[PDB]
């Protein structure tokens, strides 16, 4: 019945300012207090602040010093600005709306979320390395490293170019302000002829591939 669409820079360096926006389609834009809420990868939710169409704001004192939320009734949008960012502000930010203008501030409408990452590094495509092993199924892997932001997807192809379906998917881990992620296919032991398989990853900064030698 109502859609909130968000956007804004997803990657920043320490000390800069985070800037996000949320647009409302449907219902009235008036009187509701529109909120921004965030969630650090792997943690729980923190409410940041809210603003109604008249400009009235309520802020979580945990951020007051650095937060500014504002509204634009001519576009039916509201926006969030968070200054002097640090890695701690890396998180999925959401905009949200309560069901009634004069009721509890709990939220039935939510934006899709915007991941915003704050790192000292610069955006980079991942560099790929093969994981050769050493149960009637052998494991073959691919390691993706030094990539940012954290937006990767793997896929596997046989020398014969047919897809490998046997995919296993792990969450990236953060280090040095950049990310790494691994992936593996489990190939039945008795498949000894192909000398390798091909690992592939897609990333905003460029897609890569690397053949992963079949062992034994």
């Amino acid at each position: 019945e109502v859609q909130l669409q968000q956007w804004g820079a997803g990657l920043l360096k320490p000390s800069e300012t985070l800037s996000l926006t949320c647009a409302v389609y449907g219902g009235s834009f008036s009187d509701y207090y529109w909120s921004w809420i965030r969630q650090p990868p792997g943690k729980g939710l923190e409410w940041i602040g809210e603003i109604n169409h008249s400009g009235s704001t309520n802020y979580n004192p945990s951020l007051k010093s650095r937060v500014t939320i504002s509204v634009d009734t001519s576009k039916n949008q509201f926006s969030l600005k968070l200054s002097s960012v640090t890695a701690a502000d890396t998180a999925v930010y959401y905009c949200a709306r309560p069901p009634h203008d004069t009721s509890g501030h709990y939220w039935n409408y939510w934006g899709q979320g915007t991941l915003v990452t704050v790192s000292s590094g610069s955006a980079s495509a991942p560099t790929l390395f093969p994981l050769v092993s050493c149960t009637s199924s052998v494991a073959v892997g691919c390691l993706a490293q030094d990539f940012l932001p954290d937006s990767i997807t793997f896929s596997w192809k046989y020398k014969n170019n047919s897809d490998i379906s046997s995919t296993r998917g792990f969450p990236s881990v953060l280090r040095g302000g950049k990310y790494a992620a691994t992936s593996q296919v489990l190939l039945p032991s008795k498949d000894v002829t192909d000398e390798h398989v091909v690992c592939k990853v897609q990333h905003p900064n460029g897609n890569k591939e690397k053949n992963v030698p079949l062992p034994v």
Binding site: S35, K43, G44, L45, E46, W47, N58, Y59, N60, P61, S62, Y94, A96, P99, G104, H105, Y106, W107, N108, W110, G111, Q112, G113, T127, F129, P130, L131, V132, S133, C134, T135, S137, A139, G141, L143, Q145, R168, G169, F170, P171, S172, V173, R175, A180, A181, T182, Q184, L186
Partner: protein
């Protein structure tokens, strides 16, 4: 700020069973101004209960809320498969609006010990200056598993990171990857590399090692 505390951190049940999750508050929440949400991987929180005990539109009555003051409860009377997720409580009785830390409702199945693999850093990465030693544990249950790195039998600490998958949708198991990271230098100064894995499906801790250069 009101601290919401949820327990247990994980609830491991089977479809059909009743789930009861607690959300204690550190001061009382006025007028029973408390909401519950569900959240699935990558999705925005989804409203289930508002005003402590009222179901949001479309929420099936297997879901019910209750409680008051500093103590609230969410009950799922007979879990269905799609009910396994994370849940958060949220108070809107005073400012600032706060959330609890959540509780994961996880599928409980029979014990499954992991298959284990270790992988030496590639020769190519070694040239770039770092060695990433990797150990995988596949398809095990329950989720707790200790992965330990040994280098020349020196128990290694603070130079590894792990990453665990979501519960498999079909077989309810987990897989976990651990990475031990050393300079090429240190990697060079040693020889036996070992990944010791302990899991309750295992009668004795398993170990996969390899000798540098021998792989």
């Amino acid at each position: 700020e009101i601290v919401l505390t949820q327990s247990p951190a994980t609830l491991s049940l089977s479809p059909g069973e009743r789930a009861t999750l607690s959300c204690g508050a550190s001061q009382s929440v006025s007028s029973n101004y408390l909401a519950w949400y569900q959240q699935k991987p990558g999705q925005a929180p989804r409203l289930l209960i508002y005003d402590a005990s009222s179901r949001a539109t479309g929420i099936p009555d297997r879901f019910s809320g209750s409680g008051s003051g500093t103590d609230f409860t969410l009950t799922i009377s007979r879990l269905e498969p799609e009910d396994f997720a994370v849940y958060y409580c949220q108070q809107y009785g005073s400012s600032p609006l706060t959330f609890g830390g959540g509780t994961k409702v996880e599928i409980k199945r029979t014990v499954a010990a992991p298959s284990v693999f270790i992988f030496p850093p590639s020769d190519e990465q070694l040239k770039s200056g770092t060695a990433s030693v990797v150990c995988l544990l596949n398809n095990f249950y329950p989720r707790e598993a200790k992965v330990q790195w040994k280098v020349d039998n020196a128990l290694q600490s603070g130079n590894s990171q792990e990453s665990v998958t979501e519960q498999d949708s079909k077989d309810s198991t987990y897989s976990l990857s651990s990475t031990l990271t050393l300079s090429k230098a240190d990697y060079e100064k040693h020889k036996v590399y070992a990944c010791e894995v302990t899991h309750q499906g295992l009668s004795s801790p398993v170990t996969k090692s390899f000798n540098r250069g021998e792989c």
